[PDB]
Design a protein around this ligand. Sequence first.
Ligand SMILES: [Cl-]
Ligand SMILES: [Cl-]
Ligand SMILES: [Cl-]
Ligand SMILES: [Cl-]
Ligand SMILES: [Cl-]
Ligand SMILES: [Cl-]
Ligand SMILES: [Cl-]
Ligand SMILES: [Cl-]
Ligand SMILES: [Cl-]
Ligand SMILES: [Cl-]
Ligand SMILES: [Cl-]
Ligand SMILES: [Cl-]
Ligand code: NA
Ligand code: NA
Ligand code: NA
Ligand code: NA
Lengths: 219, 219, 219, 218, 220, 218, 219, 219
Amino acid sequence: NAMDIVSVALQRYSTKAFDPSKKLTAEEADKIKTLLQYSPSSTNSQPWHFIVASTEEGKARVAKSAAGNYTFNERKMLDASHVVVFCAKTAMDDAWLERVVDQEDADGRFATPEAKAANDKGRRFFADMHRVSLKDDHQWMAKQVYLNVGNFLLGVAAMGLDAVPIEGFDAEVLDAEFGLKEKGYTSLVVVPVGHHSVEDFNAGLPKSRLPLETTLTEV
Amino acid sequence: NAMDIVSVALQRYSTKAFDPSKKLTAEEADKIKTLLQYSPSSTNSQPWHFIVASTEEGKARVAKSAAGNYTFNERKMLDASHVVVFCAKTAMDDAWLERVVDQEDADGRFATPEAKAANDKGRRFFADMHRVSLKDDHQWMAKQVYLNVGNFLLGVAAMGLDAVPIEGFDAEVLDAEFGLKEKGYTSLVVVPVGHHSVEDFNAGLPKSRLPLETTLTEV
Amino acid sequence: NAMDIVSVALQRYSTKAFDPSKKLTAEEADKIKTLLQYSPSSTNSQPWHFIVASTEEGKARVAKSAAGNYTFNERKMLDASHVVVFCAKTAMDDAWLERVVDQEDADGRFATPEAKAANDKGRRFFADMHRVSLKDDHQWMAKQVYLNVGNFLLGVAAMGLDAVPIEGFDAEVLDAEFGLKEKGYTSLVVVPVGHHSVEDFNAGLPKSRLPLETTLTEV
Amino acid sequence: AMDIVSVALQRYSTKAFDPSKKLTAEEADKIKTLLQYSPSSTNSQPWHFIVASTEEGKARVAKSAAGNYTFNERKMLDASHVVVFCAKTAMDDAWLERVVDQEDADGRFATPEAKAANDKGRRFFADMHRVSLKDDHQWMAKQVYLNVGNFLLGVAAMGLDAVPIEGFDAEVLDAEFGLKEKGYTSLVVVPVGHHSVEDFNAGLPKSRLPLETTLTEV
Amino acid sequence: SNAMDIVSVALQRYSTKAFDPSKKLTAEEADKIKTLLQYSPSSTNSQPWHFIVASTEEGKARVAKSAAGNYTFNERKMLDASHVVVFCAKTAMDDAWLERVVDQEDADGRFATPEAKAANDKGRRFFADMHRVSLKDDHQWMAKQVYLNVGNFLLGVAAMGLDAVPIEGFDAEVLDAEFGLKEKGYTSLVVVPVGHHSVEDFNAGLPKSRLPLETTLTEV
Amino acid sequence: AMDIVSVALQRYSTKAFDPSKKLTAEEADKIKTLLQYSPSSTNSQPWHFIVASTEEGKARVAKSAAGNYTFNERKMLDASHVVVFCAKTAMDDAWLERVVDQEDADGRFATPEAKAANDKGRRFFADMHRVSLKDDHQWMAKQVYLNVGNFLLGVAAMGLDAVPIEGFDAEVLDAEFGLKEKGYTSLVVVPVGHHSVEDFNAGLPKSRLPLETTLTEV
Amino acid sequence: NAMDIVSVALQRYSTKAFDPSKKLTAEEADKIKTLLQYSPSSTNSQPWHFIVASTEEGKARVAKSAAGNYTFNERKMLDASHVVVFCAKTAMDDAWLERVVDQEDADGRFATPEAKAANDKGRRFFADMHRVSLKDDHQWMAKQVYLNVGNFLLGVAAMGLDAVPIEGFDAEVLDAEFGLKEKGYTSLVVVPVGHHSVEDFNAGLPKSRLPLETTLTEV
Amino acid sequence: NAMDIVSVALQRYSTKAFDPSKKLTAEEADKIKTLLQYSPSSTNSQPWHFIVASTEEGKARVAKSAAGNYTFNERKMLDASHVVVFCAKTAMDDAWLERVVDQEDADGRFATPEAKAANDKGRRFFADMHRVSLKDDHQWMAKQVYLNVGNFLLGVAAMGLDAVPIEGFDAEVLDAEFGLKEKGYTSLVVVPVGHHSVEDFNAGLPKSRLPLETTLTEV
Ligand SMILES: [Cl-]
Ligand SMILES: [Cl-]
Ligand SMILES: [Cl-]
Ligand SMILES: [Cl-]
Ligand SMILES: [Cl-]
Ligand SMILES: [Cl-]
Ligand SMILES: [Cl-]
Ligand SMILES: [Cl-]
Ligand SMILES: [Cl-]
Ligand SMILES: [Cl-]
Ligand SMILES: [Cl-]
Ligand SMILES: [Cl-]
Ligand code: NA
Ligand code: NA
Ligand code: NA
Ligand code: NA
């Protein structure tokens, strides 16, 4: 019980081994989903999908993505209580842009149709800038997914849970395993969540970061 | 909020109108820098730099990146107490990889020479996959920065501060203003941090997100 | 008249006599009520009441206020088509403050209860400042009434109507005749509206104003 | 023929101004014309205006946006032109003589008696206020608000955005422009220009109490 | 200038129900109202009275404390008026006060001889003893003199263009305590806020009402 | 010229009246108006007045000046008009009704409810005296003195001379006019007229205790 | 009560207000009449008459003389116990001279016929000087009356009574009211006699007389 | 207080012969001066002067006025102890009117300048009425002198002294001998005072006065 978020930031770490017997409570499982849902994103475009594998059969399917050049990650994926796959939309399409603004409307953010149209115009200006002008909407959406991941990592830490972000996995394999390409998504980061085991000596190591003198300019 | 982080996630929003007379305390200024510094990143590569503008002359320089299409963002850059520019490295050089491992060593993460070397090899395994195999290191590093942004936005919300993530600025202009190109960095996101004014009306709107039924698959 | 309003400002004048046979159309009569209603006021507190006299009997009641020392204004009050009495609330009571914000809420200006509450709070702060700290709530509310008068005079001119503000009337008499003080109001300005009589030469006298060299400072 | 009612139904208080949108030279001349040609009791014109259009000028006015009112600073800096409305602090004889002489020079009086009669007629009213009621200061401040009401509807009709600000420190503002010594005090600040795409209020319906409450027809 | 039209003033004054706290008395009006309190006549010129004039915010607040309890409806009138007057009567007609009054009349030069002064004293003491010894009446007798003063005061301040209201609805015990009156030998009787009515006072515009002379007056 | 403090400082108790100087018909009406329009608690008006102006009249009043108050006879006889101030002996319901009904007839009540409330308001105070304190007799008496005070100042302001007399036999006066049965009792006699050149109190200076003693300022 | 006539002279004064309830005793009433009777006068000529009013009806008749300028003297005459009017004869007639000497003869003052006739002649010596030579008997008699008044004022003062000599009355009115002209008299001074009222102003004032250095010469 | 003054009135008589060996004591001589001084007079105007002869030379000067036709009075004037000449003013001058009121003021009879001024007005009224309206101010003043005489004769009788009022002298001679005319006085009555001689048989004669039936009307 605190408001001490910096203590959380200084105490969390990348979990290198989970205790396969320590599970998220029902409520914690609810919270982590809420964290995924409520992350911010450019223009609130929410260009993403999440898979939460919580069953042995589920994590097993996710785990298959580690099979080739990534076997050293398999254990982490199988031992954690919950395993989240962060996926990005493969394209930013009119239908999604409409869905977003229509949801904002249903949530009651526009007092007039003029306000709604101004919101929609603003969003579409940005999105067109990426798909049409810059042709970088793929990496634009991926960046939003990573923003979500940063949010999530701190969020689960604050809940007392352990996690580790994994980029080492065959995305082509994982995508196919869940039919993501057909559905319009591509997997980007996998985050197993649970509690560390006693074999995780990373839990007892000092945190390390480059000094502000290097990474920070005050102006 | 090292506990009830979900309430924080439900209560935060993008501020548009900052009160320019409500500064961060010296304690808070230090904490935000700590959040920047302690963000996770793939292999703890920390491929980033931050500019924190807190003086009027400093904020005005950042604000120049908001000319043209982004004039509406200028006020938030000017009136917020502190303005953070998130920058990514332009290329993952060997020297940066050496610097990260040497720092992990100074901080006491490796009880022996071989533990260090193992860590180094393991980091370069990933670095080379991006630098050599995929040729996507620029994007790879920019995603680390967004993870940082995500971590930051939640952190500052937990500290009771108001913020907004701004993509609406001219990165070219900003880079030139701070000589980032020659320094090896490029700006990606600007985040004004401070306290909202009584006129920041986004504070009176409910949050809107897509339902889980759409964005979440449980297995 | 939307657009060439300056010409309108330079055509209008303070009518000295009205043609008693020229009446506002039913449409014009609505317009003028809209003008009264939709005037701005500090915090939209709308601290006012209007009597619009349009019948022989109604006008004669208002004209009583012109019966002693102000008989030079009696004819304007009797011959004009519609005579409007502008009245200030005699106190900014809690009920009114509540009435105002409930109306804004009904009109859809508040997305959340937090928004309604913040608007209520802010308005109450200002009201209390005038009643309690400054003890100038009467002058404050009378000023909003005069703001309304200004808006009104220009407004009816743009409609092609003649009008004149009258301060030469007995407000004690006029109040008593309508029971204004017991209702929590008091009369401030009377404004006859209609069309000027052929005898009113002033309709084509040159406008006279102090030069800007005297009254305006540009910086 | 207007359509002035639509102007009244479409206008609102702009809270955020686009700092890059300026009045045209012609628009800027017209707002001064509006200020100047506003009505006032006996045409006493008991006022002074400051119009700030430079960044130095608006910054000076903006000092008054301090303490509880810092939230108003940004309006005053971003808007194209910021108008400060000021009332005279006392109705002096010299001003009453100035007005009537200006009317005379403008040819409002066919004869010397017309001038004299106008002068006495104004003094009848002036004296009610400064001798009998001793409220001349409040009386003049009211004329200034009349002007403000005139102005707000004027600029809306020109297609310009605005907002009337009472949340500023009049003492600071008066001192910054040395108004007390000059015989004036500031009352309302009206930033004028074009609203930002992010102006919240432009996205909100207007709200007024219904006529059933505020209007009595007889 | 014009003759004093006092009846005109009687016909215009009224009991003010709402005061404007922005409209203060002038400093000359302040001194004059105190002269009115002083120069009121009284039986035998016995001046059995004390006056509290509250002009400050702290001052009016102390007085307004008397309006708590069953008289909260009088509190606002006591806070909003420029000046508030508390009329108090003496608790006893003591020899000391009799002596004080007769000596003041001497110092003011009303007596040409000791024989004039002594007769004046004897006359006053007769009346006083009749009330305090014989009739057992003195408190009421003195209270009447204070009410006479109030009547003089109400008409007076009206003539000066001021608004006032006589208030009997207040807690005398409390008011006395607040000012340690019992000890000083006085008790509070009437409170009179003085100043100017606000536009909230609709009573200022109401016709005056009085029973017709045909009921209250016998000519003979 | 209306300066009422000047009146206060100039008025005094007249001991000797000029029997040849009468009030004008208009002054007689005016003093009646003063009696009538005096203020009183809740406007309860708990009083009756006898105005003796004939030789026969004043003499009937003068009878109350006997025994110890023989020196007051001449004042009552020599004055133009002699006012006897009387209080009700009891505040009865019928009088309370009469007052409120009169206020109603005079148009002081916008609604039947306003009238009812005025009634309750008065009875709130009446009952505090009638039922609780049991001091209504004295309460009304005090209203009469208020009237006396108002009257003394008024007639002085009219330029008339007067004196408040308590030195008379009230029982005798009451019996002479049948007051007890009518429901009243006499409290104060005030002769009104003009002083004779042998009214020497007119040559004495006024004397009051100093404010230093009688006034607390806060 | 021992005789101290100078005390009486120093204590007496003109009473202005009489107590109407204080009467002379029957004995005092005889005594004041004895005073009037036994006053000296030149040659014992006694050229006088006295009205003594003791009834309300009586004094009212005398008080009529106090009108116009002298109405202020009415209350004295009405309030006093006894009011005395001193009247002088209007001519010295032979019948009166005869009456006086016959009275002296009846009272036993003359031892011989010569004595009586000598006294008669001697009185006429003086009487004729006045009514024949100087032609001033009117004044001469009126002087005797004033002599009587001086005797009287001091006498009643010695009796413990208060009084005042009134010249302020209309003699013509008083004369007519009593049919004095026809009777051969005229009124000169009125002296109310009785007891002062507690409100007699003059009773509390010091006597004032000019100093002897001014009024007296010693040789 | 209640002294037996009537007895004095009934015992006094007009001395016909004085005992030249009997003198007033110094105290008696002070007293009679007081009697002269303290006499009342109309408006206290005190229109008089007194010469008191008590020496052989002084009495002889007064006695010159008895030469010629009045030698029958010579012995009284020479044999008495003190001889008082009563003189009236020849004119009531503003100067005297002023002296009187100023003396009343010095004696402290006036509480305020208002009182003094009224008294001075009242007196001047009366004075003017005599000197101007009636033209009888000589007689008016002479009457006051007689009043004084009457008061004196009873006064001195009460002191146990003998006296006699004398009119039979030559006032022209008496005036001349004391330069009275230039001083503004004229002599009116001479009153020798002392003790009668054994030879004055008149001391024991019955007193004679007309009956009240003739001289007094009671109403
Ligand atoms: Cl679950
Ligand atoms: Cl944010
Ligand atoms: Cl105009
Ligand atoms: Cl000018
Ligand atoms: Cl000027
Ligand atoms: Cl609105
Ligand atoms: Cl609004
Ligand atoms: Cl409506
Ligand atoms: Cl009395
Ligand atoms: Cl005869
Ligand atoms: Cl007289
Ligand atoms: Cl004789
Ligand atoms: Na500029
Ligand atoms: Na719009
Ligand atoms: Na009547
Ligand atoms: Na006769």
